[PDB]
User: What shape does this take?
Amino acid sequence: MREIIHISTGQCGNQIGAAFWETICGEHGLDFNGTYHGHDDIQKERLNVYFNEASSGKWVPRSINVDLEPGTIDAVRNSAIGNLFRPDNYIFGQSSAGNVWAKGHYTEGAELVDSVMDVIRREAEGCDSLQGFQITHSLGGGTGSGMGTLLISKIREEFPDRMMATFSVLPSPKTSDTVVEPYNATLSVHQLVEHSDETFCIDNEALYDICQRTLKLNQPSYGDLNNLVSSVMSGVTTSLRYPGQLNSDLRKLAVNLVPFPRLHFFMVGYAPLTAIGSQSFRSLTVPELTQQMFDAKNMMAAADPRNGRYLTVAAFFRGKVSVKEVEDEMHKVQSKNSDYFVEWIPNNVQTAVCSVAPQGLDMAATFIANSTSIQELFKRVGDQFSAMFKRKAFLHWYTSEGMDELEFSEAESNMNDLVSEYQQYQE
Amino acid sequence: MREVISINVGQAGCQIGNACWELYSLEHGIKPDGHLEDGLSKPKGGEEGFSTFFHETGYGKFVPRAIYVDLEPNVIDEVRNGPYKDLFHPEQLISGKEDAANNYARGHYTVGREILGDVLDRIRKLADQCDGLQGFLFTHSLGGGTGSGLGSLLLEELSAEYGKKSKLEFAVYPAPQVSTSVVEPYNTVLTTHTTLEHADCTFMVDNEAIYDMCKRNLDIPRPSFANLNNLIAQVVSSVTASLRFDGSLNVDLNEFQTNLVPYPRIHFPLVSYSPVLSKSKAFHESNSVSEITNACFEPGNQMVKCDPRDGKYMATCLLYRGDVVTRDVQRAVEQVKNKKTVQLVDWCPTGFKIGICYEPPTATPNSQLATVDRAVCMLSNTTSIAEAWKRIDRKFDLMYAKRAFVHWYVGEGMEEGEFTEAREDLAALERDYIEVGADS
Ligand SMILES: Nc1nc2c(ncn2[C@@H]2O[C@H](COP(=O)(O)OP(=O)(O)OP(=O)(O)O)[C@@H](O)[C@H]2O)c(=O)[nH]1
Ligand SMILES: Nc1nc2c(ncn2[C@@H]2O[C@H](COP(=O)(O)OP(=O)(O)O)[C@@H](O)[C@H]2O)c(=O)[nH]1
Ligand SMILES: [Mg+2]
Assistant: This one.
């Protein structure tokens, strides 16, 4: 379908969400005050993908921002980007989650769960074109991993046939913001794969590299990192937002990008990376994008895929791009680098030409695939999950809520099984 | 016989159909709005044909008897916002809503069945308007399941509905070396069963082969589906040519059943087409039908990724358009037989259906293929064909062995036994198809 709800949760969800709508509104042109600026058919016949034609032609997106920290929304509705969101969608309350996966929903967070379902239910009725639910949060974040994970299960009961897209941000196994980041991530996957259908891997540490290597940025910031993720979220939708020679869809992804059920983790990869200053000495062409998409340095997951093995890649070129420009370049990668692609697929390529182009560039393309090296990202969380809590440290905070030690052990056994799924299915 | 109804299913099918209708209106002097313009001669719009493709209007706004079927609104919207908006009755543009994705379990069933009631009644009303109704002409893809699976159901329904009209089916196949969809072997193989048992004559087109021709014969640096489809449209228009225009040797649509189909099965002719000349060359070029005829056997003009030289000759058809002498094409054929390529099997012993249509070829402004005063369309049941089946069957095998993607079909109305049976029928065809050539 076309009408899709973009749910937001967690301290990072609203941040990435603010930059998300900032880019979506720039494509078809839409002022933050809700004024129409499309030119014209392509920027008018596909405006209901996220907005609604309210009174006086005032367009407002469909997003339910939820968080237990009222101090976060204050820095959005007050400053720029605020008139778009409707005040009735704001659902916030005191105090907070406490940077823990238990209290985030198992106790305190269970109070607002009844209010979030009420707003999402009413919007679902009026929207005669529901398809899925786009969620953006952190895998180890407090309100993101706790209240965000439980929300996926509630929506799964009332919307089983509907899809469920998530943009979780994996932790950094080197520069962690909080010591209780890996622990909260072990419990989020316990219910994520048991409800959601597709989840993208994002790592902030992997962004600082491309920001200083390609973009040539010395001091990145959260305001800039969200732009990179916004380009990915806005890329897997152009087919549904604008016509093209081969319009893909979120459903077509799982039918191809997901071989077997127990495998929802993807590896994003936007391209080309516009280098500040060094963008004029380049030639935007398809052969140049293929060399950057498959580059292990541009991964945002970002385990080295060369060490592992690809499964089903996918590209979404934009702008002035033909059909053979991709089928040829993408096919050459299947020969010289055949050792990295498995044979039982067998075709390891998937295209989806669009029509329009992103603002500021003449052509763009993303990269999404399932590499066998994703298991490495889970081993880092599994080792820290057990090596740190081997002596029962920082565990009384979670057991005091009500969860028993048995509940935390089952979460580790599931992750250990996922690592084996990538060997059956030999690497 | 007289009438023919066109059916487009899925995006690729619709895109190709667009090209065909553009082309047909060009040939008959019909403007983008219909009406008329003028419509005209002998037999431009008509005199008969039309009506053959276009429905007569008491105003002159002629209406293409075409039905567009899709599950994705976007494709049809393109059509509805295109320059040919006025060539279609709006109620012939059967827009869907929720896609079947990719797809067959939904396409031939859980989603597709929800619009067929409308589709079939559309057809029935149209068919009642028609006289004779010699056949239906399907245009679709065997890649995505809407074109494959939905198209399949619709085909079946018309064989049940009538079962006596000619069922043509122009099907686009996956290139053996490259494709845009991972589960395509399932979406293709799962329908070989039904096209086998419900189409009377299928055509197999490979995009890759055509792209080769575009890059090489037409000198195209950057091919496009628009160009590719224009080529296909021209091929389709010739099938067909003598059902609209005057010809020395007129070919009935049923003619192909009589000439190309020796057994109930085997109905999968290859197409080839020439002259394919870029505008830059059509000055140096100037030739006889004997040379054009040679080009038709040349692998470079096959529009299908297989080796006709490997295969043996079963019945074939050479349709000619424009300024063509019947003696000369007989001479040309004789010379071709003497090449001893596509060894003529004893079973024919020769079987060259010659069709001679007086109407010169034409190209729309969207094609850079030069217009010519004569052209040739070739059809053939040459035994090279089973290799295409083998290719896709190996892809099917690897996947199915691990199952993997089977999940997406079984989980929504299917059974693994169905996948097994589809494979078995395909395998059976490879065998039978080989045996009738293998014997001599
Ligand atoms: N010649 C030609 N081939 C096309 C065209 N469009 C698509 N194809 C080919 O047909 C197949 C694509 O089918 P899709 O567009 O994915 O699907 P569909 O058959 O329209 O139906 P769905 O899967 O339900 O969308 C591929 O093998 C393409 O290479 C076209 O305009 N011309
Ligand atoms: N890319 C990105 N990551 C963020 C942003 N904000 C927090 N993060 C990441 O999210 C993790 C922290 O979780 P947090 O969002 O504070 O959790 P919550 O707010 O309690 O749900 C860290 O790994 C951060 O790098 C952001 O705006 N962009
Ligand atoms: Mg389609």
